[PDB]
Amino acid sequence: EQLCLLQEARQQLHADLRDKTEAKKIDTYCHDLTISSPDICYQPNSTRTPKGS
Amino acid sequence: MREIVHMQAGQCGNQIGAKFWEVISDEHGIDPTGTYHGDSDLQLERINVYYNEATGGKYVPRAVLVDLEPGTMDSVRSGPFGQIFRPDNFVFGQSGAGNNWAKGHYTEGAELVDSVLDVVRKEAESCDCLQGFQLTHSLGGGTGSGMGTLLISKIREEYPDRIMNTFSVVPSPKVSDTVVEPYNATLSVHQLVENTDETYCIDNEALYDICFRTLKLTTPTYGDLNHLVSATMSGVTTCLRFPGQLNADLRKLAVNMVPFPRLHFFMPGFAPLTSRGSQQYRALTVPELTQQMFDAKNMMAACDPRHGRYLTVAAIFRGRMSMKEVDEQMLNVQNKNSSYFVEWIPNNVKTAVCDIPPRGLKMSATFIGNSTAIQELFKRISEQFTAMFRRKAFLHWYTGEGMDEMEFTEAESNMNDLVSEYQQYQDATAE
Amino acid sequence: SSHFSANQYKQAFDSRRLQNSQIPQTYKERPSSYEGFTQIIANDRGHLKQGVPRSKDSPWGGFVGTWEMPKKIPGNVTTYMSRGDPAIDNIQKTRAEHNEYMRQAVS
Amino acid sequence: SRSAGTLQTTHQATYIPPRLMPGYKGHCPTMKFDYGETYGNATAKCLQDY
Amino acid sequence: REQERLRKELERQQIASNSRLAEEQNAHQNFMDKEVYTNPPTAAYFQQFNKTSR
Amino acid sequence: NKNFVNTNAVENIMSVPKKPAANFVDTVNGATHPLTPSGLMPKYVKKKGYG
Amino acid sequence: RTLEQSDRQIKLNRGSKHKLTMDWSDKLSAFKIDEKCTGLNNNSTEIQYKE
Amino acid sequence: RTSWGIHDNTTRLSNRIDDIETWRETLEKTLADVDEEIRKLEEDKDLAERALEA
Amino acid sequence: MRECISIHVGQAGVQIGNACWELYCLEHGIQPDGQMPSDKTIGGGDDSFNTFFSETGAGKHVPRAVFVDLEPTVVDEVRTGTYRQLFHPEQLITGKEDAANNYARGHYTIGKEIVDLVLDRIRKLADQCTGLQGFLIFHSFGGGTGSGFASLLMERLSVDYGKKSKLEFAIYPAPQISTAVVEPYNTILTTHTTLEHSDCAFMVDNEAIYDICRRNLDIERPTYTNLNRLIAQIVSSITASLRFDGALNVDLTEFQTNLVPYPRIHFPLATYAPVISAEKAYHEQLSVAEITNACFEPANQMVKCDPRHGKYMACCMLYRGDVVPKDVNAAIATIKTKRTIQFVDWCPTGFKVGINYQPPTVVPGGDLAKVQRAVCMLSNTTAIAEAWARLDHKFDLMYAKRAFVHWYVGEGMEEGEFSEAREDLAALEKDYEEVGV
Amino acid sequence: MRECISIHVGQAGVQIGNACWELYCLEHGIQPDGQMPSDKTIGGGDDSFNTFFSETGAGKHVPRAVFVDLEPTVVDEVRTGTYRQLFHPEQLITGKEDAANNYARGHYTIGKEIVDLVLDRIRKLADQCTGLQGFLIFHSFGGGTGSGFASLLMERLSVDYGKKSKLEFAIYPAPQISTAVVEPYNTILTTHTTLEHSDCAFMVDNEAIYDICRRNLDIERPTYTNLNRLIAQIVSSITASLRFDGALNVDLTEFQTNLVPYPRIHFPLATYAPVISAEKAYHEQLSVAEITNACFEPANQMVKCDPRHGKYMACCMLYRGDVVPKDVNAAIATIKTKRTIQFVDWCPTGFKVGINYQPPTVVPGGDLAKVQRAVCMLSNTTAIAEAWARLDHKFDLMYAKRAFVHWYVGEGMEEGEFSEAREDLAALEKDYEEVGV
Amino acid sequence: MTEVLSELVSDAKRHKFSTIPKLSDDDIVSVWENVANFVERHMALQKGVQIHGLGTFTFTQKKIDIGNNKFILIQRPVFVLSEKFAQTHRLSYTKHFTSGQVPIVQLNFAVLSNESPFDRDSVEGCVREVLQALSRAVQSKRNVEFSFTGIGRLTIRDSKVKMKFYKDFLTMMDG
Ligand SMILES: Nc1nc2c(ncn2[C@@H]2O[C@H](COP(=O)(O)OP(=O)(O)OP(=O)(O)O)[C@@H](O)[C@H]2O)c(=O)[nH]1
Ligand SMILES: Nc1nc2c(ncn2[C@@H]2O[C@H](COP(=O)(O)OP(=O)(O)OP(=O)(O)O)[C@@H](O)[C@H]2O)c(=O)[nH]1
Ligand SMILES: Nc1nc2c(ncn2[C@@H]2O[C@H](COP(=O)(O)OP(=O)(O)O)[C@@H](O)[C@H]2O)c(=O)[nH]1
Ligand SMILES: [Mg+2]
Ligand SMILES: [Mg+2]
């Protein structure tokens, strides 16, 4: 009974940690973006706030 | 936000309603837990018509399951889509019915009706528009007939401005399965004609015939019967849940189909219904759906459309289609078989079009017919009733549970003069 | 309660010119003249005194809601031309019924 | 309790200072300066009333 | 003509500010609908039953 | 053996029209509210003992 | 294996959306260039002797 | 205000990178704590279960 | 300045209003957001849109329409999709219970629930209007809201607004195709109450346009979108002279004066020409005389009443495009010399011409081919007496046994209204007989 | 020297003032701690706050208010809230034990233990201000502190200050919605002693505010916070003429002289227009003509009554923002030419306008929108005769068999006071009828 | 004030268009006498007569449990208005808490036509036209006092319905 709970707590943390590592990948990509970067342009909406924010 | 309260009485009514909520939960993409798992928002706009919000994204059906035998209550709780229902609106008794209309009406069936009406009142004033009440049962047993008619009378006494549509499985004589079913049917048709203002009579022999010819169906059992009944249950209220080119709800169908108040027993149908071997030989076209609606063997009320004259015909289509094609087909049927139509009503067809087909099919159709051929099943019930009332058979049960023979005479006289009213309106000159 | 004219500017201040497509209410244009020492004909309460020619209209004004309008409306023909004599007669009949029911509802 | 978040009145929920007035989901997304805390465990009551 | 253009630009500024306030107010309304005004009972509401044998 | 065609048309001639519901809506979405209790219909100014 | 395939389709979708936003941003900026050009008349104050 | 505007949000993005790492490291250590705890519990599950045939 | 208020009541009215305001936005260059594509100066800067669209302080075009229905499905479908930001949400009135094909439900029940709110929205729009020209009321003579609430609303409009123009666009039940069953009952009861509170009612059925789409457009199975697009073209050709400069301008106050010879005779027909597709217009040289002959042909009529069976009273010809008044005059002269077209003896001057220079716009992905000239043909003829006689025969067949009367009475209308309505249209029927001689 | 003393009696008054001083300090740029920021956001001295805020030696801006209640926790949550440093400590006066919905307990037993202290505090504030212009008493007619102690307080203010103006903001009980059973007793007991000791009492109904928030702001489930924000905007629009600049400005002595015809008919009605949210405020005209048409509307009154079923006496109109006198004039002219409004016979001139320049200030967390125009309309109509007659009927239902009278008898008051209150309000009914005659 | 004798029966007899013009003013009164005896004899055996029309005659059982298998019952016969007629004519019914432990029987045309020298086609019209005439009297705003002789009088004064039960009925139906 306890091993199934300990497995379940591992499964919650691993799904959380997988989100943290590649959210840092997003934020590092935004941090390294500069004025002279070629992947930089006007956006259609940009300043929207998505649902689940 | 017009919305319908569903009630289901007896084993037959409970199984039909379980299949009905299964079908209209597939139509809205709702899992048996209660969450919405669909793809489009069209399945989510009018989800309040049949489902009530719970905490989170849970959708609890607005259904009341009533029975005097707890075994069917356990069966419909533990069967497919049994988790969707609320355990509080599972009011039951632990006595039984015994296929006795007197026991279901004037005895312990009337013990349960207090809690039954409490549950239905809770669901009814949990509303905001409350389109009407929709009941399913059978006129063959005790709880289906007696208790069902008791709920019909009480709900009509409470809210006599709401659309009350009941379906009811009428007994066929060549299916039998009960010896007191003419008594149970005659004692309940009186309450049906007097109180209910929309009735879609369904017959088990017609269902079996549809399964055995139009669907082959080597062993249909009671699953396919309730499946077809659920198809016609969804096809009459599809326009409340989905938008369309020409909308028509239960009140509009009742207005356009019922000429006189005690003239409201219908002949439902569905299309397409294609066998597996003939699946690839068939192309779904609006004339093909119109023909399969206007085919005699496709009927679900054991009447023959050629054996009578239609008064009014409601035709509810589903899917993307052409209004011109629909209108020319529904005019061409009137122009072709004009002899099977009353001439004192021009345009004997109400037409509705909804552009949201069921999951799977691209087009589908639903027939509702206020034919005067509905009198033949009532005549069969009346002749079996007088056959087993000539010698006063099986009356000791009803007199023990508290009825006199005068109630049986009222039931026979009301059924006889209702059939005579059908015959008189059927054999009427134009003007 | 006093829409007492504008002389040169009566061409303006019209309901048609100030975006009021509804029919307008007729106040008394062209003010009159008096002599002086008007009677007080009241008290310090809002009363009308005894012997004053009190009106017979409703103190709360004349207005009818939707659920007390007549079920039938004549239609404001105001023409009485190219119609038959029974048409003229029953148009007068519905006009009289309209006026009577509005008068009864106001009073 | 702490876990249910039920000790907030209507006045404390709505009458927040105007410099931080347009909050999101009943919080202040910019006024937040305490991150990464480890000392403190949530007991059975805290995890049951969450 | 410059006064008319200034009036129209002031109107446009008001529209932009009202659009930001509108998205904030819609977020607040959705927050108060899907949260706050809901009552799902937790385990502590049922824990306080059957905790005494007497 | 009564003539149902005649004995339905008779009360179709001379059955009772019901009084329409004295209520109103204002939300551009429905939301029917009764008008007689409400605040809009004047009845207490009539009363019997207003003065 | 399906998770690593679904991660590829996410980057392909956002890669293709990025190429659209390359083109759409060029249309907005070209719209503003033609926006000031259409408004130029003889009495325009914008106007200039230039090579 | 434009040159300082980019620099202000570059530090805000850099603050969030350090903000995730304060929680990404603690969640990584708890996974090592859970994995060690699972390994210890499976051995002690086996020890009592090997005592069943004893 | 030439403001018009469009009240779309019923499902038919709301769908026709969708197809109308789409064409109006395409004409005036309005996106489905309410904004000009370019700035205030270029690509616009005019004030030609104020007949239909009012302008807020920022430059957002919002329509002068009031969408009314008692069911919520169609109005919510308008509220959520494409033109979701164009239409005003307070001008999208909907209710809970529909009238369910019942004149008396739409007249005394739920129709009377909403009329205060509808008149409030209408008077707000009229206060916005600064030179209002009239009300274009789009409805059907079918069932429910299009009959009962439309008749009640027009009664209230006649009560409060005086003698303002109240032009109906009415979907008349076709002689063979008809959807509802109680449709003759509703049509009798609504024409009885809209005989007096009306100025003019353009009568546009569905079966004639079905035959037109089969024969001239080769669709062979059209739908409500195509039907409402043709109706939108009709109303655009009618209202064009209030927005576009022309040789002969026609305003909304003129149609009653030039199409109503006698009171209670205010039901003219409608026809659009040249309604034809591109692969057929490739082979044609479409000119003024040809499209006038197409208008007077008894197959392009958009109501199934052939003019061979009656006499014309009035004839409004709205020419629209690169049309020349010389060829207009020649075409009308040769129509007058033509004998199959028959005009009544007491009307030597039976024609009224309105010429507008704006070419007929085309909806992208539409049905109609682009042409340089078009005619809105608007005739008041005695051939509609056949349709009135057929509908009265249907009413008498339904009313001899008095089926479907218990619904109306048991939810609130007196049964004497049926008899007085049938008497009113019998008087109308004799009126058409006496006008025809 | 345009100072105003704001008294807030009862729970309703305390919460209304809690939402009100928020809006005042946001308008005047005063921080929640009471310290005005050192330059960089404000210009110069800028002593426009002096009408509501005084200047201590520490630079703190303490308001000219008094929050008085016969209960803890309701003023104590203010003392422990976000404005704990803005209010003086004994400025906020609390009792120990409730009057508890009892006029007798709030007027004869518990009120005469705190009335002396609140009079002393009012005396200190009045001695501090040198241009004392009036009192603003915010209370409710639900009863307890809001009725008994408010009546006692106004009775002592009448003899202490004499002819100084005393405006009231009274939360009148709703017709069908009631949070207390004994509300008719409390309201009719306080509206027998208020009449000879008042000047003008604006009348606000919670159910009407609920309906306004439901049909305009699109909040389907509003809250007392939203209510008190609306009354805060009303009183801000009233007092903006004292703090800000305008074309023609309205003194507090205007509100008695230009609004009440007779000494005991001093119950006018507030109305705010527009009251629209930001989701729909981008999509209307915000014109002064439309906001006048909206404030002259039964669907936008702050009290649940129909003004079309009665005659107006006076209308004090505070136009606030970017308004111009001629568009104001044309709006008033078209209202005077409307049908549904009928003025009373003896009052030719029934309007009094005040044009201000400062636009309304929006709270960032409220429900309203940033607009350039607003109208606070104060209407003295005869439609409150229905409300007074309803109160008299609800009094006569209970008092016919001496229900709930033993509490009032035992708690100081005698039996006859109910009879004199009933006779006084019957005389008020007769006055309201004979004025309309 | 409007009784049942000599006005409603006369209107239902002449009644311009009538199903039953042959039966006399004594006969329509006697068939409602039979209806009254029918309602009496079925309510005596703890049942309730429901007529589609006016309404339903039931009880209000006031059952207080004494203890040791004893109970005191206060019985009161009540007449609940049919809600269809109440909504049609807007009469303010008196709501009565009626339990479902009362068997409910419809009006028995077979019983009313058995001992009568008449038939079903006449006994059905004898109640339908009387309900229609009572509805016409409600339209006419005349004070209706429609009698149920042997039971009580149903009074419609001004938008209100109340039934006064007779003393003998109230003392032999109480149990
Ligand atoms: N030309 C055209 N006619 C339509 C359209 N939709 C509905 N109709 C007509 O409307 C009739 C059906 O009645 P409706 O007008 O829709 O009824 P309603 O106004 O919505 O009121 P209810 O009966 O309560 O639903 C049909 O006979 C059609 O002829 C449409 O989109 N185009
Ligand atoms: N508009 C508005 N009214 C309120 C508010 N809070 C309370 N009320 C009104 O106050 C009435 C009840 O009287 P209270 O103000 O609560 O009581 P009190 O004046 O403090 O006197 P006590 O009853 O002795 O405590 C209710 O009917 C409400 O209408 C509020 O926040 N806004
Ligand atoms: N079509 C159909 N008929 C059924 C079903 N179950 C039972 N019946 C019929 O119902 C009749 C008996 O009714 P019953 O269920 O006993 O009614 P109850 O006593 O109230 O539960 C039998 O003649 C069956 O033919 C079903 O699932 N579908
Ligand atoms: Mg509709
Ligand atoms: Mg309090």
Tab-separated table of C-alpha atoms and ligand atoms in Angstrom, chain B residues 245-247 252, chain I residues 9-13 15-16 69-71 98-102 140 142-147 171 178-180 183 205-206 224-225 227-228 231, ligand 1:
chain	number	residue	atom	x	y	z
B	245	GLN	CA	-31.631	25.861	-40.375
B	246	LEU	CA	-35.236	25.287	-39.220
B	247	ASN	CA	-35.571	24.687	-35.481
B	252	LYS	CA	-43.722	23.315	-31.705
I	9	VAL	CA	-37.920	39.259	-35.965
I	10	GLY	CA	-38.025	35.468	-36.029
I	11	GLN	CA	-35.546	32.875	-37.238
I	12	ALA	CA	-36.203	33.834	-40.864
I	13	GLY	CA	-35.702	37.495	-39.997
I	15	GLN	CA	-30.988	34.667	-40.905
I	16	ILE	CA	-32.022	37.195	-43.571
I	69	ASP	CA	-36.308	35.927	-31.491
I	70	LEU	CA	-37.957	33.944	-28.723
I	71	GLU	CA	-35.752	30.903	-29.099
I	98	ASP	CA	-40.150	30.130	-28.291
I	99	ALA	CA	-43.632	30.826	-29.617
I	100	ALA	CA	-43.699	27.315	-31.162
I	101	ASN	CA	-45.583	28.301	-34.361
I	102	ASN	CA	-48.380	30.129	-32.560
I	140	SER	CA	-42.163	35.557	-42.146
I	142	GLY	CA	-45.063	31.362	-41.103
I	143	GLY	CA	-45.459	30.661	-37.406
I	144	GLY	CA	-44.724	32.169	-34.038
I	145	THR	CA	-42.508	35.227	-33.678
I	146	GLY	CA	-42.677	36.203	-37.357
I	147	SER	CA	-46.460	36.578	-37.123
I	171	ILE	CA	-41.861	35.627	-46.258
I	178	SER	CA	-44.941	25.038	-46.657
I	179	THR	CA	-43.181	23.954	-43.474
I	180	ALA	CA	-45.634	24.450	-40.612
I	183	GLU	CA	-49.245	28.382	-41.042
I	205	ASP	CA	-41.806	33.498	-50.815
I	206	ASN	CA	-39.417	30.522	-51.013
I	224	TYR	CA	-31.633	29.197	-46.879
I	225	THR	CA	-28.242	30.900	-47.270
I	227	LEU	CA	-32.402	32.433	-50.476
I	228	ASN	CA	-31.383	35.054	-47.916
I	231	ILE	CA	-33.327	38.695	-50.432
L	1	LIG	N1	-36.150	32.710	-47.133
L	1	LIG	C1	-35.972	32.180	-45.927
L	1	LIG	N2	-37.060	31.747	-45.198
L	1	LIG	C2	-36.885	31.207	-43.969
L	1	LIG	C3	-35.614	31.084	-43.433
L	1	LIG	N3	-35.727	30.520	-42.213
L	1	LIG	C4	-37.034	30.286	-41.966
L	1	LIG	N4	-37.763	30.698	-43.049
L	1	LIG	C5	-39.228	30.640	-43.185
L	1	LIG	O1	-39.802	30.594	-41.896
L	1	LIG	C6	-40.833	29.636	-41.825
L	1	LIG	C7	-40.767	28.929	-40.478
L	1	LIG	O2	-41.246	29.763	-39.448
L	1	LIG	P1	-40.288	30.825	-38.714
L	1	LIG	O3	-40.372	32.182	-39.369
L	1	LIG	O4	-38.871	30.311	-38.724
L	1	LIG	O5	-40.833	30.859	-37.202
L	1	LIG	P2	-40.216	31.904	-36.151
L	1	LIG	O6	-40.358	33.305	-36.686
L	1	LIG	O7	-38.777	31.561	-35.866
L	1	LIG	O8	-41.096	31.734	-34.816
L	1	LIG	P3	-41.330	30.281	-34.169
L	1	LIG	O9	-42.467	29.595	-34.879
L	1	LIG	O10	-41.673	30.422	-32.707
L	1	LIG	O11	-40.068	29.470	-34.328
L	1	LIG	C8	-40.598	28.666	-42.967
L	1	LIG	O12	-41.809	28.394	-43.631
L	1	LIG	C9	-39.645	29.370	-43.906
L	1	LIG	O13	-40.305	29.689	-45.108
L	1	LIG	C10	-34.516	31.516	-44.162
L	1	LIG	O14	-33.385	31.411	-43.694
L	1	LIG	N5	-34.700	32.064	-45.412
